[PDB]
Design an enzyme around this catalytic site. Structure first.
Site, PDB file in Angstrom:
ATOM      1  N   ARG A 111       0.718  -1.274   0.000  1.00 55.74           N
ATOM      2  CA  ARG A 111       0.000   0.000   0.000  1.00 55.74           C
ATOM      3  C   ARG A 111       0.754   1.338   0.000  1.00 55.74           C
ATOM      4  NH1 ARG A 111      -4.358  -1.024   4.503  1.00 55.74           N
ATOM      5  NH2 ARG A 111      -2.638  -2.291   5.341  1.00 55.74           N
ATOM      6  N   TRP A 280       3.109  -5.372  -8.784  1.00 52.04           N
ATOM      7  CA  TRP A 280       4.307  -6.161  -9.089  1.00 52.04           C
ATOM      8  C   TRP A 280       4.558  -7.107  -7.897  1.00 52.04           C
ATOM      9  CZ3 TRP A 280       4.849  -0.627  -8.994  1.00 52.04           C
ATOM     10  CH2 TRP A 280       5.335  -0.107  -7.782  1.00 52.04           C
TER      11      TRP A 280
END
Ligand code: HEM
Ligand code: HEM
Ligand SMILES: C[C@H](O)[C@H](O)[C@H]1CNc2nc(N)[nH]c(=O)c2N1
Ligand SMILES: C[C@H](O)[C@H](O)[C@H]1CNc2nc(N)[nH]c(=O)c2N1
Ligand SMILES: NCCN[C@@H]1CNC[C@@H]1Cc1cccc(N)n1
Ligand SMILES: NCCN[C@@H]1CNC[C@@H]1Cc1cccc(N)n1
Ligand SMILES: [Zn+2]
Lengths: 411, 407
Positions: A111, A280
């Site tokens: 995050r 990713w």
């Protein structure tokens, strides 16, 4: 009410006020904690308050709470609901919404990147072919030749729940799993059921160990359709070890783009059932879970034999030793092929900084400890030693039942 | 009302009903989960006692019998009359074994019924206490073939005559803060070590100085005592490949003996109930040795292995971690001191859970603590959903005595 979380490695203490804006249920009672349990069409009636809460947050975020633009929007949405039973979001809100759904993902350690999210508005989409087109652009954009970029594609919201847009795949890219009559499994065991569905739908499965699955897409509540992602778009990395030359001979590879596609996106009451998103990989998702879970590729033994570890007694920690090398191999390959990836040390440290920041500027950061701590070396990463508070805020990403269990076929 | 827990590695689903008898609070609400937070009258007593005895009699197939009823009124009369009560030995043992049985944070509960209980309720002084602990240390160490045990001192009366063992474990190493700003020994004990000195201890200011017991009896002031050196079995750590390993000068004691908890049975509170079992490898190798705030030796072991510590992605910390833990299990086995590795420990717990679900309808278990601090997902418990809740008898945390002692 104020809640404090303490880090037992630094004594640092934090105060959570954000949970006070938590409306949803957690699964836990005063008499029971369900913290380690994986899975624990609205009326006009409930809709406006939900729209109102959202738009209030939105207008406060842009510093215009109580403005005329604000009041007008509430009135606009209010009327549209009473008139059409639902309401459309402006591009700014959709964007602001998606980022916050990510920002509120308590099980996500990545995050710190929430504000950098490319949002593709696919609400004008009407057919599966239309969906396929959108998805390819997402894969191409997000892959960016290895220098990956976070992105999400948002298809039309649910209306009467009979016209749902759904991406039947769990991730845009995953390898097929095939059950052999001898009971063994070829490919990724986690995808056997879905692979079967794909085959049944007409997919000609090459039946190898790393077959990129076809996309199965449902548009407007119609039966899903198959599409093959252009191969040239699927970035893959062959896995080798920096010091072990036999590693490459294990024949392992992995795609570079993790793109979750089976979640539902809730914003201001509206439900977006098809909203694939990608970032990713953190090394451990592939090297620990994907390769070493007993129910996945289960490569722990084969890697152990080659290293010639004492496998007679677990107390030799052969399993532990092999796991490390395998993960070393995944990080090495990705960096060598210049495909974005982050190790669990870097990721957890960054998250800790992100978390603290969130308390200071937002009054909290909901986080699920069970998922934030990596599946290996847990206590030598800072998150292990960090107390967290898990609560649910919207916007949010929710689980939704697999479409094959609810879809009403039309044939 | 009936909850199910799924193992996502084997798909097995278990139904938990035991949680319905849960009595104490978890710290969570329907709005917020606190699962990762480390520390979340005669009228009061009889119900607690009743709850206990019923379950006791139920366990000995004599629920609602005369003995049950009789005992039930006897304790009842005594509470009203004496404003408390004493447990029959049988109840004490059953109580203790079950407090261990209900320890949702203990991965080794499959061993729960094989617990040696030492009734130290006739104790009256700190010396008596020291005598009891030594006998306990000796019996449990057993020349390396460790046996689980717990010694129970007198229960609480009016909080002004509480028996307490000031150490957190019968056996721990001292921690001194040097001028170097650094810390010598175990930083976790820095404060307690000071309190010792403030009481007289002659700290040898070493890196691994077995601390002195600091015992408190009947509310009096804590007294010092030095466990007989010949009773504290230790294991010097050597690696089975790295001969240079021995030069870090690492050693750990063989007896894990928690002494600061509070045992609660039938409403009664035993504030001094040291207990011991045997180590799971990771406890020493991962937490004691590597926790940044503990002996924090990773960097050092790193240098000796000549690993590229330039970047985190080389996973050097991870490689060191494994070796440091291979050595621990190695040293202990070599010296024949009992010890279990985290793979074996967690595997045993899964089987135990399954026995508990089918023979008791559940097993409270705290996932955050059950999953070892290394190689989490390759151990089976990582994939095991668990339900956490509180059952009595139980072991509870309690304020360190120095932050509450009226000298
Ligand atoms: C920038 C790269 C990112 C990294 C390294 C990161 C890392 C992670 C990891 C390691 C997990 C847990 C993986 C698992 O066990 O399934 C995860 C979960 C999650 N992430 Fe991220 N993430 C990133 C970007 C994103 C993005 C772009 C979103 C959404 C906009 C997102 C949403 C979530 C959610 C919803 C979960 C939990 C999913 C579930 O409940 O199964 N992540 N993330
Ligand atoms: C015989 C082998 C045993 C093994 C392998 C075992 C292992 C463990 C482990 C790994 C922990 C976590 C320790 C930590 O991280 O601080 C734990 C905690 C605990 N165990 Fe056991 N244990 C055993 C025996 C016992 C005995 C004999 C009792 C009680 C009679 C017991 C009671 C508990 C309690 C109460 C805790 C949690 C303490 C806390 O909250 O800090 N264990 N055990
Ligand atoms: C049963 C248990 O909750 C389950 O194995 C969880 C634990 N932690 C996890 N953590 C992450 N990041 N991802 C997962 O899939 C899980 N699975
Ligand atoms: C903050 C968090 O609760 C804390 O680091 C926990 C995590 N899991 C643990 N698990 C065990 N067995 N022992 C511990 O001391 C801890 N510490
Ligand atoms: N059980 C949920 C499956 N989640 C899968 C497990 N690995 C990739 C994806 C999570 C995810 C989403 C976004 C970014 C990221 N690194 N990881
Ligand atoms: N921080 C709480 C105290 N826990 C300490 C940490 N390690 C020994 C003890 C737990 C314990 C109790 C019984 C057996 C065992 N192996 N471990
Ligand atoms: Zn909880």
């Amino acid at each position: 009410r104020f809640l404090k979380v303490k880090n037992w490695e630094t004594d640092v203490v934090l105060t959570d006020t954000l949970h006070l804006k938590s409306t949803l249920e957690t699964g836990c009672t005063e008499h029971i904690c369900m913290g380690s349990i994986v899975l624990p069409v609205r009326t006009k009636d409930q809709l406006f308050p939900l729209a109102k809460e959202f738009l209030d947050q939105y207008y406060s975020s842009i510093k215009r709470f109580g403005s005329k633009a604000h009041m007008d929007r509430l009135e606009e949405v209010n009327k549209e609901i009473e008139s059409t039973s639902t309401y459309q979001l402006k591009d700014t809100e959709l964007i602001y919404g998606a980022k916050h759904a990510w920002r509120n993902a308590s099980r996500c350690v990545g995050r710190i990147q929430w504000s950098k999210l490319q949002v593709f508005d696919a609400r004008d989409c009407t057919t599966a072919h239309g969906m396929f087109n959108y998805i390819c652009n997402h894969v191409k954009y997000a892959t960016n030749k290895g220098n990956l970029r976070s992105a999400i594609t948002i298809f039309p919201q649910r209306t009467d729940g009979k016209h749902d847009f759904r991406v039947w795949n769990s991730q845009l890219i995953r390898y097929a799993g095939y059950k052999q009559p001898d009971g063994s499994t070829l490919g990724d065991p986690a995808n056997v059921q879905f692979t079967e569905i794909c085959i049944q739908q007409g997919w000609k499965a090459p039946r190898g160990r790393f077959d990129v699955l076809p996309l199965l897409l449902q548009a407007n509540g119609n039966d899903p359709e198959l599409f093959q992602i252009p191969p040239e778009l699927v970035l893959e990395v062959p896995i080798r070890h920096p010091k072990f030359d036999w590693f490459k001979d294990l024949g392992l590879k992995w795609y570079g783009l993790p793109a979750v596609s089976n979640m539902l996106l809730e914003i201001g009451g509206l439900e977006f059932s098809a909203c694939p998103f990608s970032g990713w990989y953190m090394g451990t998702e592939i090297g620990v879970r994907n390769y070493c879970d007993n129910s996945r590729y289960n490569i722990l033994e084969e890697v152990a034999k080659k290293m010639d570890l004492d496998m007679r007694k677990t107390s030799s920690l052969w399993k532990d030793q092999a796991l490390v090398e395998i993960n070393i191999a995944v990080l090495y390959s990705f960096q060598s092929d210049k495909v974005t990836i982050v190790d669990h040390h870097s990721a957890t440290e960054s998250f800790i900084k992100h978390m603290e920041n969130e308390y200071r500027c937002r009054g909290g950061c909901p986080a699920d400890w069970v998922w934030i701590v990596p599946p290996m070396s847990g206590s030598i990463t800072p998150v292990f030693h960090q107390e967290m508070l898990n609560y649910r805020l919207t916007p949010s990403f929710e689980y939704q039942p697999d479409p094959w269990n609810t879809h009403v076929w039309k044939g």
